[PDB]
Amino acid sequence: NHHDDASKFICLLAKPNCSSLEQEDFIPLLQDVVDTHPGLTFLKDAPEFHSRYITTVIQRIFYTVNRSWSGKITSTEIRKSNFLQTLALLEEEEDINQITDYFSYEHFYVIYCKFWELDTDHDLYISQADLSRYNDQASSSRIIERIFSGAVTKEGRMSYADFVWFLISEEDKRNPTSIEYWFRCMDVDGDGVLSMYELEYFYEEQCERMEAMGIEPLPFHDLLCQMLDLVKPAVDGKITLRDLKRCRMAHIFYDTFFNLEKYLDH
């Protein structure tokens, strides 16, 4: 609708005559939430955590709401999300950690500590090498190289904000942002489909791995058959994001190609 809650929300935070919101536009809203909410008022006295919390909540808002990945939230995007409802719930709930969408402090601190552990040089960036060791090398060097390629964002450095997107996507491959996130990493040539040679490229490292452990890996041919039966894409040699969301098993597909540990566990 033209004058709905989403539309009025946009007009409220947007710079004048703008129909969309950028990350910066949410800052005064977050500052207000942190200054007023009883669960968050300790943050006034911990400036590094004050800033990191706001950055993290904003990443989470965009992660879930900004489905076009444009960096600009529209009223349509808000209307299809639970953000305004979550604001309505925020105004009552006194335990910030019960607001598990967007705002949870506990969730933020989990993310912060994980970032802290990976930021080996303590320079506020994560290197490709360090990220490769996250979760005991759970991810392949080829998918990590793709993360650092610009596919989901060269300085060779992942910022705190971008780590938020990585972390959420690595832990939860069932939400649509994550599925797109891994799709963009697997879509090496960026043509919007996963071709069989893009699949082989990732699978051949898992093979180079398996072989190095003394495991004879299942031949590409049979695995690809499995994955096609799994996904049932419209076009076999051109798997789309739509095919992967529709099959409802995208996370299995993804593990099979770049999380060797979670694969063997299947």
* Binding site feature residues: 187, 189, 191, 198
In terms of phi and psi (left: phi > 0; alpha: psi -120 to 50; beta: otherwise), the region of 218 is beta
**Footprint of Ca ion (CB under 5 A):** 187, 189, 191
Residues making up the annotated binding site for Ca(2+) are 187, 189, 191, 198
CB 79, min distance to Ca ion, A: 32
CB 210, min distance to Ca ion, A: 24
Please say which residue, 24 or 191, places its beta carbon nearer to Ca ion.
191
How many Å apart are CA 4 and CA 1, to the nearest integer? 6
CB 197, min distance to Ca ion, A: 9
Q: Residue 251's CB: how many other CB atoms inside 10 A?
A: 18
How many Å apart are CA 114 and CA 108, to the nearest integer? 10
In the chain, the amino acid numbered 10 is I
Please say which residue, 34 or 241, places its beta carbon nearer to Ca ion.
241
Please say which residue, 190 or 219, places its beta carbon nearer to Ca ion.
190
CB 189, min distance to Ca ion, A: 4
CB 190, min distance to Ca ion, A: 6
CB 188, min distance to Ca ion, A: 6
How many Å apart are CA 260 and CA 209, to the nearest integer? 8
| Torsion angle defined by CA atoms of residues 220, 224, 225 and 229, in that order, rounded to the nearest 10 degrees | 160
How many Å apart are CA 136 and CA 149, to the nearest integer? 22
Of 104, 137, 124, residue with least CA distance to 209: 137
Please say which residue, 189 or 204, places its beta carbon nearer to Ca ion.
189
What is the 3-state composition of the chain as percent helix, strand, coil, each rounded to the nearest 5? 60, 5, 35
Please say which residue, 238 or 262, places its beta carbon nearer to Ca ion.
238
Please say which residue, 77 or 187, places its beta carbon nearer to Ca ion.
187
Burial class (CB in 10 A: 0-12, 13-18, 19+), 193: middle
